Write a protein that binds this DNA or RNA. Structure first.
Ligand SMILES: [Mg+2]
Ligand SMILES: [Mg+2]
Lengths: 156, 122, 1202
RNA sequence: AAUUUCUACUAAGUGUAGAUGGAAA
């Protein structure tokens, strides 16, 4: 967890150094692609702290804005509206289907003061958040694979 | 006269030189030119050797702290053992390439004195 | 208003601190009684084991359902591919069929007995139980979410995106394209079919199925899809043993028998892919190293196959053995040719005979295009190297004997290391203190690694024409095995270079998966963590989940024992929290809201996209305003004071307004005796945030991190450092024990090691143990902050520095250049060219209380490199040196930062990619890239600690003058206040006028030397100055299209260095050579006499004196005394520059010596870039080129002085 | 030779001067 840490980063670093000549298309689109790739490598690094309310973090329309300016094809995302990924509105929702599950066991009703049902909704919203963000992440990997096997570069 | 003595002495000198030329490259190997050979050759009365150089002071051995002017070294440092070897390699090959240019002069002297007087030395 | 009053509060950041945490009172024994360490020690260790169990079940799932799939479109893919093709978008139907086939196995998995409960919660619960592993998988009964970093990737194993690790891409586009390749190559084994060998044994002991032609006919691909089928297939290729000593033959051996008639020329059947290192102890690492490099190891057999391959190499064609272009190409070319530049030279001539005109002189742009066209090519053929070669050079012998020399060299180091792979081997000393054993291992590993690096270039990235596939097929089949040595090199190296101590830690969870995410009051009974101040000994509070409300019912105590207590109200993410709450079924049933408001949010016209309407979104703005006023938590706990409704041209502006304001930490008090009685009850846990500055002895300046953290709770904290969340906590273990630390005793005169201390020896009253911090354990704490969360002066920094520098009228410039004499040499230049301050950075001043004690790093470097020399250059010495350089390029940054503040400048910096510099500064090239990183890191947020925090340049209002680092190429040609500049012609240049030599005067022949000596204008001799004045134009020489003056009146005097190390006179040497050859040389020009002689040694000892007239750099390379830069051309005042003439002043007007000159020229190149910054419009400032060429640079450096 | 951590220290005596952005493969 130090040797492989340096190895996997210097391999990829050599590929980012090496692929600045392969494109040979209209422009310096390598800058936008490496900027996107490192953005991917932050996102997929700690997706989990996006679930926290106030973690050190801060989408799709901004990426498409910075991508149209250089002239690539866009990304064809899965959603643009983004406002339903649940993070720490644990005081600010109710409609979920698994109340049928939670009433199949004892649990309690829809009042989260019970210390048992709290984690039993926290688990589901955590998994729904991660399942939303990887559906996001697969769209970026699909964009990089399409732009990889169209122009013969290397990004993953 | 007894020029065979000087010739066999030269021939065994050749057979040490060409035996281990490589340890002449080391800094302090057990070793120890042209003006001395011509001095011992004029005394018996042969023709001299007609060497390739007499100045001798640029064969690089282990002044690896004491030089810089090589374009080839710059080319090696142009692209990132490793380098060290290129500097060591190039001076080793330049040393061997100097010493065989020396050695060919002695073999040329022996071939000239061979096919003038019909003896045998190589 | 100078050039740093703009650059503050420009963009965000996120540092994170790291303080220690000591528990107070009975908290530690309370933790040990309630047993809150064993749980998370298990919750760290058992995770890889439960990963092993879930990988067991997953592979059982694959091998389960793969026995139930028979692919139907397989024949329609195989025959339509091996059809000869001739596609016309039939390969597109092939790819459609391929993705549909992956979809078919994807659909098999989707319906494969549920599969919806394969990555949800119940997988740790229900299926995986049905030994003693029931508690192992049951150890996470209330804690599931840590598997979500696994349930995503093992889901992506079952995709169809043609990803690498996935099942579908493997089993359709690698296994099938190997299978049908073997199906076609089955046509070239039918001529050797002996049933006594291929059928009488294999079919009887392997399957008892249909015979060997069924595996090549394509309708048992559905049988070979499982890993059992791949096992049977690789059994028919390689040969099973069936636990008996037969060693039953295989198809590889049956095709290997065919070259008994010394002609194989038939490719073998490639084995099929199946479907799914040390670092602890000395005996283990020695055994695994024995396992991987003994005399029957797989890597060693790969070397044996490779040496026999290059023994029988001559049978392959020389038309396909492609040698890789690039770094190694020059080295490979040099060994056979005897000259490094011979291959480049032949390609040069081959290119210029086509693209060069019928002239011969070049331009520098044509040279750069020439170098680009040489780097355009991918690889070279061995046949083209035979084409380059003249007579008596057969590469098929030359490379063969080179590689057999290397293999015999590996055999000789085996003859050195043969005492190591013996069964009765002993370890007399651990590898930290032993030398002979570890250096033996080093020589072995580096020798095999060098062998790999030599073999490496025989790939050609191919992707080629008809390359010798019969050669590459076993070449890669040995090279995959030779590449495994890096798994041993990066095991042994990072085993030996690790510290004796160890920094392993596990996240502390305290019985809860939801732990310290935030610090919000009215969520603190959920997050269960708070922070208390008292005087200055800060505190961290942990409340147990049985008693999770032990801070709510506390009175404002009045018996004067108090802990102040945070409140920390933070509205998190207000652009997407406000619509999350104000439309969520309970606010919609507490406020009404209006119908048009609900519709205007549901259609969503507040966003951009031209549906954006001001007086339509302003009602939404008023609705947000009034509703936040009506909300009970956010009407009180903040002080929201917005603008008016017409004062928001964007809801992004309103979001920025509420994000700006919505953060406030105050302090409502509490008791002391009841809090400490409470932690005595054990319902609280209390840790003290601590480092080596919260002690009550710290009589100096703090760490910068403790300056930030003390500034997190100031009333100056508006400008603005917001304590964020995402905090963690950690726990270490005692790597060392207490006894075996080498301990300096008390009351003894203890030594020193910095030699420039006047107190050459000191003594202390107590002990100072070596590495006390790892004797016990310690609680590391992290507490991540977010500096400048709301940015105000937002602009493109790369343009704002330029539009600043143009309007500026005397802009200072720093340069920083590496040198042989000094690793870093600083030169500060005004807007004209006057050197303001030039000094070395080998000595480090530590300007504490009043006492400027310096310390050298240059002596430290050489004193450690002598240990490197005397210790056979092993890994510990290497990494010790690399860390010493890392500490040095840490401590440079304070000098560079303070210099930037003191002179209001822009740093120049040596670009690296252009290179073309010896760079003999005695430091590794990588260390300079790390200096780049640890300079742009720090100039992201420049702050000096001694300043006042409120004032600009302080810990609240730091300078941001860079961007963040992106990627190792994107650091080029501008970064804020750091400029990148190519380092061409910066060390060997006369600073007074700008003469540089460009004359290739390495002697070649009298045939060249006669023309070269006639090309000069007037070689004469002045008797009233005793100088051998030369004269030339430059235009009559090759490689000379860059200078501007081209009227260079050379001279001779000044000391010079001759190998003979010796000292010789430049003009006395000329006179003694010309009196050796008997000249009346006082009636110049004397070229007419010089073009008469015919002995070699005169010209050979003249070229070596021309070169010494031209050699400007002089290094005695054994002492630092005479490193003198002298220039054999004089300026208008008739005096030519000498370095020692300019060393002995206080502040010179020219560079002192060679490294300082190397800095000063870089500063001059940035000054030229500023001069072109002054000569454009503001609409091209983002496009004004900075890559100053050699021609432009020599022109500027000559015409600056006049 | 002490350190949240690293480097160089012993720097007025349990530390000094600079730097340091953490978890994750
Ligand atoms: Mg301090
Ligand atoms: Mg230390």
């Amino acid at each position: 967890s130090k040797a492989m840490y340096e190895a996997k980063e210097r391999y990829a670093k050599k590929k980012m150094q090496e692929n600045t000549k392969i494109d040979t298309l209209t422009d310096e689109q390598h800058d936008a692609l490496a900027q996107l790739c490192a953005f991917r490598h932050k996102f997929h690094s700690n997706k989990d702290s996006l679930f926290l309310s106030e973690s050190a973090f801060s989408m799709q329309s901004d990426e498409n804005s910075k991508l149209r300016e250089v002239g690539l094809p866009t990304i064809e995302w899965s959603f643009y509206d983004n406002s339903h990924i649940p993070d720490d509105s644990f005081r600010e929702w109710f409609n979920f289907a698994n109340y049928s599950e939670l009433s199949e066991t004892i649990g309690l009703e829809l009042d989260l003061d019970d210390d048992e049902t709290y984690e039993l909704v926290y688990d589901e919203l955590y998994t729904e958040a991660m399942g939303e963000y990887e559906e996001l992440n697969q769209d970026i990997e699909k964009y990089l694979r399409r732009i990889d096997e169209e122009h013969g570069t290397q990004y993953c | 006269d007894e020029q065979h003595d000087a010739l066999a002495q030269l021939c065994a000198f050749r057979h040490k030189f060409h035996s281990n030329k490589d340890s002449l490259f080391l800094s302090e190997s057990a070793f120890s030119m042209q003006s001395d050979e011509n001095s011992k050759l004029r005394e018996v009365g042969l023709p001299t050797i007609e060497w390739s150089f007499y100045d001798n002071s640029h064969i690089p051995d282990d002044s690896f702290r004491e030089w810089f002017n090589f374009a080839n070294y710059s080319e090696l440092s142009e692209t990132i053992d490793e380098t060290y070897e290129l500097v060591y390699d190039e001076l080793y090959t330049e040393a061997m390439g100097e010493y065989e240019e020396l050695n060919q002069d002695i073999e040329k002297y022996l071939r000239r004195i061979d096919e003038e007087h019909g003896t045998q030395y190589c | 208003m100078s050039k740093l009053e703009k650059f503050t509060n420009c963009y965000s950041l996120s540092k994170t601190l790291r303080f220690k945490a000591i528990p107070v009172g009975k908290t530690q024994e309370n933790i040990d009684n309630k047993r809150l360490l064993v749980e998370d020690e298990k919750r760290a260790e058992d995770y890889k084991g439960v990963k092993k169990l879930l990988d067991r079940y997953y592979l059982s799932f694959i091998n389960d359902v793969l026995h139930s799939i028979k692919l139907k479109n397989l024949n329609n893919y195989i025959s339509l591919f091996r059809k000869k093709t001739r596609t016309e978008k039939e390969n597109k139907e092939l790819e459609n069929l391929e993705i549909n086939l992956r979809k078919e196995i994807a659909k098999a998995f989707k319906g494969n007995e549920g599969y919806k409960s394969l990555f949800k919660k119940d997988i740790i619960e229900t299926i995986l139980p049905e030994k003693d592993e029931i508690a192992l998988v049951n150890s996470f009964n209330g804690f599931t979410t840590a598997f979500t970093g696994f349930f995503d990737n093992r889901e992506n194993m079952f995709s169809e995106e043609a990803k690498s690790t996935s099942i579908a891409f493997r089993c359709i586009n690698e296994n099938l394209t190997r299978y049908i390749s073997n199906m076609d190559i089955f046509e070239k084994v039918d001529a050797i079919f002996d049933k006594h060998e291929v059928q009488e044994i294999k079919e009887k002991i392997l399957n008892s199925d249909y015979d060997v032609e069924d595996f090549f006919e394509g309708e048992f691909f559905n049988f070979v899809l499982t890993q059992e089928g791949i096992d049977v297939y690789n059994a028919i290729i390689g040969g099973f043993v069936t636990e008996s000593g037969e060693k039953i033959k295989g198809l590889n051996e049956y095709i290997n028998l065919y070259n008994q008639k010394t002609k194989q020329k038939l490719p073998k059947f490639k084995p099929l892919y199946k479907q799914v290192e040390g670092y602890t102890s000395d005996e283990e690492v020695l055994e695994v190293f024995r396992n991987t490099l003994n005399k029957n190891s797989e890597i060693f057999s790969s070397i044996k196959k490779l040496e026999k391959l290059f023994k029988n190499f001559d049978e392959y064609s020389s038309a396909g053995i492609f040698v890789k272009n690039g770094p190694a190409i020059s080295t490979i070319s040099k060994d056979i040719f005897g000259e490094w530049n011979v291959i480049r030279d032949k390609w040069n001539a081959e290119y210029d005979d086509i693209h060069l005109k019928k002239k011969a002189v070049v331009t520098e742009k044509y040279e750069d295009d020439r170098r680009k066209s040489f780097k355009k090519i991918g690889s070279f053929s061995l046949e083209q190297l035979q084409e380059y070669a003249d007579a008596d050079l057969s590469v098929v012998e030359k490379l063969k004997e080179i590689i057999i020399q290397k293999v015999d060299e590996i055999y000789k180091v085996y003859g050195s290391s043969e005492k190591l792979f013996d069964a009765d081997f002993v370890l007399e000393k651990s590898l930290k203190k032993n030398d002979a054993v570890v250096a033996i291992m080093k020589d072995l590993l580096d020798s095999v690694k060098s062998f790999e690096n030599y073999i490496k270039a025989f790939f050609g990235e191919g992707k080629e024409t008809n390359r010798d596939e019969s050669f590459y097929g076993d070449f890669v089949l040995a090279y995959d095995i030779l590449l495994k040595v890096d798994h041993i090199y990066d095991a042994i190296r990072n085993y030996v270079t690790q510290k004796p101590y160890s920094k392993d830690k596990f996240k502390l969870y305290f019985q809860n998966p939801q732990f310290m995410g935030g610090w919000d009051k009215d969520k603190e009974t959920d997050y269960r963590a708070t922070i208390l101040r008292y005087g200055s000994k800060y505190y961290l509070a942990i409340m147990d989940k049985k008693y999770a409300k032990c801070l709510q019912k506390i009175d404002k105590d009045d018996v004067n024992g108090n802990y102040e207590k945070i409140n920390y109200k933070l509205l998190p993410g207000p652009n997407k929290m406000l619509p999350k709450v104000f439309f969520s079924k309970k606010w919609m049933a507490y406020y009404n809201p209006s119908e048009d408001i609900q519709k205007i949010y549901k259609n969503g016209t507040f966003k951009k996209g031209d549906m954006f309407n001001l007086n339509d979104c302003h009602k939404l703005i008023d609705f947000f305003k009034d509703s936040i006023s009506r909300y009970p938590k956010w009407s009180n706990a903040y002080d929201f004071n917005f603008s008016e409704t017409e004062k928001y041209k964007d809801i992004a502006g309103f979001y920025r307004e509420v994000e700006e304001q919505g953060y406030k930490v105050s302090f409502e008090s509490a008791s002391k005796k009841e809090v400490d009685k409470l932690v005595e009850e054990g319902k609280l846990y209390m840790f003290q945030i601590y480092n080596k500055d919260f002690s009550d002895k710290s009589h100096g300046t703090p760490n910068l991190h403790t300056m930030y953290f003390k500034l997190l709770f100031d009333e100056n904290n508006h400008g603005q450092i917001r304590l964020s969340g995402g905090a963690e906590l950690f726990m270490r273990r005692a790597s060392l024990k207490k006894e075996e630390l080498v301990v300096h005793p008390a009351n003894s005169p203890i030594a020193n090691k910095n030699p420039d201390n006047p107190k050459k020896t000191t003594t202390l009253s107590y002990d100072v143990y070596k590495d006390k911090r790892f004797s016990e354990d310690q609680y590391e704490l992290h507490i991540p902050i977010a500096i400048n969360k709301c940015p105000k002066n937002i602009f493109k920094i790369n343009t704002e520095v330029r539009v600043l520098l143009k309007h500026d009228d005397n802009p200072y410039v720093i340069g920083i250049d590496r040198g042989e004499r000094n690793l870093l040499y600083i030169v500060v230049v005004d807007g004209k060219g006057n050197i303001v301050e030039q000094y070395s950075l080998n000595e480090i001043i530590n300007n504490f209380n009043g006492i400027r004690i310096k310390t050298d790093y240059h002596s430290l470097l050489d004193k450690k490199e002598k240990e490197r020399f005397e210790a056979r250059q092993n890994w510990t010495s290497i990494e010790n040196i690399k860390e010493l350089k890392a500490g040095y390029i840490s401590q440079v940054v304070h000098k560079i930062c303070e210099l930037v503040e003191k002179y209001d400048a822009v740093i120049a910096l040596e670009d690296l990619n252009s290179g073309f510099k010896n760079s003999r500064v005695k430091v590794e090239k990588q260390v300079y890239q790390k200096f780049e990183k640890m300079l742009i890191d720090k100039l992201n947020y420049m702050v000096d600690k001694k300043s006042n925090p409120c004032a600009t340049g302080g810990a609240l209002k730091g300078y941001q003058i860079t961007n963040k680092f992106e990627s190792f190429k994107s650091m080029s040609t501008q970064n804020g206040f750091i400029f990148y500049i190519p380092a061409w012609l910066t060390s060997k240049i006369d600073p007074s006028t700008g003469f540089v030599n460009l004359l290739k005067t390495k002697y070649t022949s009298i045939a060249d030397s006669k023309k070269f000596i006639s090309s000069f204008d007037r070689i004469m001799y002045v008797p009233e100055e005793d100088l051998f004045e030369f004269a030339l134009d430059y235009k009559n020489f090759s490689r000379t299209d860059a200078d501007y003056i081209k009227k260079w009146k050379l001279y001779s005097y000044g000391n010079r260095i001759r190998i003979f190390w010796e000292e010789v006179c430049l003009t006395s040497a000329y006179k003694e050579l010309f009196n050796k050859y008997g000249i009346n040389y006082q009636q110049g020009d004397i070229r007419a006499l010089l073009c008469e002689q015919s002995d070699k040694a005169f010209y050979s000892s003249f070229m070596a004196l021309m070169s010494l007239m031209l050699q400007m750099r002089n290094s005695i390379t054994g002492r630092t005394d005479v490193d003198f830069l002298i220039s054999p051309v004089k300026n208008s005042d008739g005096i030519f520059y000498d370095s020692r003439n300019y060393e002995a002043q206080e502040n010179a007007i020219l560079p002192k010596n060679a490294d300082a000159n190397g800095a000063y020229n870089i500063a001059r190149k940035v000054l030229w870039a500023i001069g072109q910054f002054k000569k454009a419009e503001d609409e091209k400032l983002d496009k004004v080129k900075i890559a100053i060429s050699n021609k432009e640079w020599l022109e500027y450096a000559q015409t600056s002085v006049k």
